[PDB]
Amino acid sequence: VDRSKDQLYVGASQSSLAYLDGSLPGDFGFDPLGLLDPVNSGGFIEPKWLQYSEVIHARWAMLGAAGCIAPEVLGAAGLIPDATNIKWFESGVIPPAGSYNGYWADPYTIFFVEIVAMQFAELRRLQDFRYPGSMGQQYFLGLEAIFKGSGDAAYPGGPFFNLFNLGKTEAAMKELKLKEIKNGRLAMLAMLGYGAQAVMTGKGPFQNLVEHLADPVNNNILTNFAG
Amino acid sequence: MKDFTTYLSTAPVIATIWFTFTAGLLIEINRYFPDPLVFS
């Protein structure tokens, strides 16, 4: 996967150029396994679902990448009490790695609210993919006015999801989508970096960066194989 | 549902339910009246 920008990436192949025509955001021709070929597609391996899933992964990853390091950066700057300067994997998500006592409820009590809240958010989002525009019809406390969608599942738009109606022009919107995808793809790799770095070193993402800057040669992946 | 209830009416399904019922009745009788040899 060619880093940076370019017309085509390293893995671009003549076979993938058949259907990759630049219509999708961040379409750099990289599809060595040819999972986006329209011909004889079905199930979840089809262009509409795979492109939709990438954006959803991009947006969750962007929140995760910024949220898995902010407590360490803010804690390092003294803007939050040291009691909350906690590594992302020691928040309580993985109790064996570490858990934080001091939340207003037991982490399982909080999880049930997460289940119910995400059931509504995710199943309503799904129903717009299966039946476009269907969430703007049945009464939902008057909120159905903002759930009418825009025909494209990954980009609902509307009064809320496009609060400040940025990208009014077609050219402007394409650039914003490209910027969203590149930041999202970068964050997805960052999250994978957090997970791999946590296992290899056992420290937070911020600690690894600080140590690397201290002695870059003596602190890197190669030296962390043994300690 | 009409077709599904038709499937349950097929010979193998009826026999399984019928013998499952018949066997259960005999097993339960011998559970509450163990070792019957003479009417008495």
């Binding site: 040819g34 999972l35 597609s41 079905g42 199930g43 194989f225 | 077709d3 038709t6």
Partner: protein, 742 residues
Amino acid sequence: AKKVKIAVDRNPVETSFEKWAKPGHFSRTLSKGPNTTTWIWNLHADAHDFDSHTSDLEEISRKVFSAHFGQLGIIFIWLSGMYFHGARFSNYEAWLSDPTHIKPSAQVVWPIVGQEILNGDVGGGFQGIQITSGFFQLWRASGITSELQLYTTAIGGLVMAAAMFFAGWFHYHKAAPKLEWFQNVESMLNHHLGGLLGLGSLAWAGHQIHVSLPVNKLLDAGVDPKEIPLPHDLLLNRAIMADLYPSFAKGIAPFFTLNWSEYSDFLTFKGGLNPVTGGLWLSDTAHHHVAIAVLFLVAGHMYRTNWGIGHSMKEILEAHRGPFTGEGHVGLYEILTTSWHAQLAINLALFGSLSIIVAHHMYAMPPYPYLATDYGTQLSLFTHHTWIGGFCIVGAGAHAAIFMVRDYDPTNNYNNLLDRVIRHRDAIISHLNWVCIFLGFHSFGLYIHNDTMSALGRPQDMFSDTAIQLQPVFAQWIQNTHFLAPQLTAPNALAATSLTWGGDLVAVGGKVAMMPISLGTSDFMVHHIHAFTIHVTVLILLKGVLFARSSRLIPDKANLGFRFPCDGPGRGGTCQVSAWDHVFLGLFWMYNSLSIVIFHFSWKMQSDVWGTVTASGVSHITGGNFAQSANTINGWLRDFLWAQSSQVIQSYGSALSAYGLIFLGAHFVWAFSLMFLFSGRGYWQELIESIVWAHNKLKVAPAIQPRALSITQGRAVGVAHYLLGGIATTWSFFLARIISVG
């Protein structure tokens, strides 16, 4: 250059119960409904014969793919039940503390009609049926120490079973792969070599290195199971692992710096058996699966899929062309990518042969702790996996003949290896015929010679070790070569792979786990019985395949089909000429040959290996009577069948009384089968006519006209009952015997 890609069709079929209410929908003949009772049998006989329902290869492939998901889902329910019953209805936790004195048990019966006597006294304050499946030994090796761990696996097994059934429905009714997808044999081998076998071996090595090895190291040291660290504590705390294995203190740097010798403490090459448990070292087993993982991952990069590099299987076949074989392997690639039966014939042949190899290697190199000293488990596992291999091989002959009748096309096969084999089939069968006659005389005739000489009071004239001798010199040479292998030919191995080659016995809990096996005159004679009965089974099955299409008797046998009873009483009589009947006859001989194999194993082990260790020495269960007694047929009747059947016939009134009942019941089913084998449906159709008359007289005659079974179904019903009765008879006799004394 057709690209390798995913290809499916959307919603090929509709999910409805409509066809569940219309039996026979799959076939044009049976769709009209029943008029005679023959229709009912035809419904079940042809249900899974996809190749005859439709002529479309794509439709056939899609049914096979989803029918395989159903088989996988069923195994997960079965596996889940075995793990669940271990958690809830077993004495596994007690067994871990005292493995050498407590009998494994995982089945409990309800107290009804007085059957609670089958809940025997197995130990650990528990009553239940003793099991011989070896699940306790497997669970210990993997590191399972609580019933909670067994319970979680069972729940995971049910989730997998649900996933398997969803996949079958999904890939038939929702997204069915197209025919071009199924024909990527190069891609399938790459994934199944490096992905299924390769990553599967690597993943299991990860479990053994991180879970099995630490847990079993402490269990052998005598630590109480409840006080052992949990597997996740071992994973998270490198400090704990360093104590057991100091190599973990260095992390994974040795792996990437190629200092692989650092891992010598848990990646060993000891060989032999662990003295404390009598099973293979788990450190040896971990290095085995790590080595196997690399070999298969390399194997999975051999075939060309989408990026030029690799091999084309078609090109390999067409390049291997010699002077003696005409065209050669040309045309095999098209055969093996368009005929499911041809693929099934090969896979059943080797899968069955593999199951037999498993039986020999597992007893000789017991891979689990406390497997060897549990004689019931050793006998059961060897016998189970020999029978599985036997049936699979006979199936290989069955589906080789189906290919020959249905999928064989002469135009694609001209002067190639397949064609040339058909053109000298008389030469092959005539020679194999003579070899079987030669082997029958010079192996079974020796037993008749010994029986007659012994009855005449001429023991000096018998073939035996105290008389005319027949020493397996070739086998004895190999036993000695493998015994001395660690000295010169395998220098880095500390011990021989097995204790059967030679050396000293290993005893666990006062019982022999394995000791050298000596081969004498009796072993020479019995082995050549095996060669005789195996060669005859090949003759019957190979004859059916080579003559499936035509013979000097029926020149147009292919048009008659694969499964027909005869071509009439003409030409002197043509009963049982079809290739299906060669499987029917081959099943009897496979049963005959494997019965001697499992009798040979049972008597040899009890006589020469199994026993109790004491101060003076080893006393075996049957006291070493194999050498002197197994050279006559009378010896087998008296010393093996008559003497060892004492346990089963005295089982009434005890927890083993169930085996006594099944011993009689099996004898019954076997004899019942001879009714179908010795008779013909002509008698039975006339008998039903008189029976139908009585029902007609009482206005109680059925609308579906009763019919005697067909000719073929009489033979199928006969052999199925013959096999069940015969095999179940040995099954009861073995378990009641070995459990009672072993």
